[PDB]
């Protein structure tokens, strides 16, 4: 009881360190956390032969990006 | 640096009014002040659950707005618009 009320709540921390816990929590919680989908746009986009007949190769056919 | 600011102040003025609230019984007490029994990670990691609904923190809404609007101009930012 007592022993868990002398440990100070972040409210009596001194800003900075509650800024940095602050910073740490916040990635953990929200930047790691946060999910977004783009594996399969990226993969066809790689994928795409680009124009390569309409720019002038004069060359065997030359492998995509994702070759 | 304001947004730890106002969190910790409205820490303050919740720790008082859990004070100021010890008369019925102190079977609540308990499971009111283990947010500040807790460690300064932990209270922090627990105070920040406001993503989604699951609205588990006591983080009033005045307060979570600020960070949700904050996270979504660092998206944007991002490129993740």
Same mark, same amino acid.
């Given at each position: 009881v007592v022993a868990c009320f002398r440990?100070? %709540?972040?409210?009596?921390? %001194?800003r900075h360190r509650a800024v940095n816990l602050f910073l740490q929590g916040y990635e953990k919680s929200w930047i790691e956390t946060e999910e977004h989908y783009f594996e399969d746009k990226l993969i066809e986009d790689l994928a795409k032969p680009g124009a390569e007949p309409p720019?002038?190769?004069?060359?065997?056919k030359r492998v995509d990006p994702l070759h | 640096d304001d947004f730890v600011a106002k969190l910790q102040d409205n820490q303050r003025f919740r720790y008082n009014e859990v004070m100021q609230?010890?008369?019925?019984?102190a079977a609540l007490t308990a499971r009111k002040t283990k947010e500040f029994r807790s460690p300064p990670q932990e209270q922090i990691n627990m105070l920040l659950?406001?993503?989604?609904?699951?609205?588990?923190?006591?983080?009033?809404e005045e307060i979570r707005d600020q960070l949700l609007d904050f996270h979504e101009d660092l998206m944007t930012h991002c490129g993740i618009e």
């Open positions: 440990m100070a %709540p972040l409210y009596n921390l %001194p720019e002038e190769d004069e060359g065997t | 609230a010890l008369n019925m019984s659950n406001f993503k989604d609904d699951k609205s588990e923190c006591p983080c009033p």
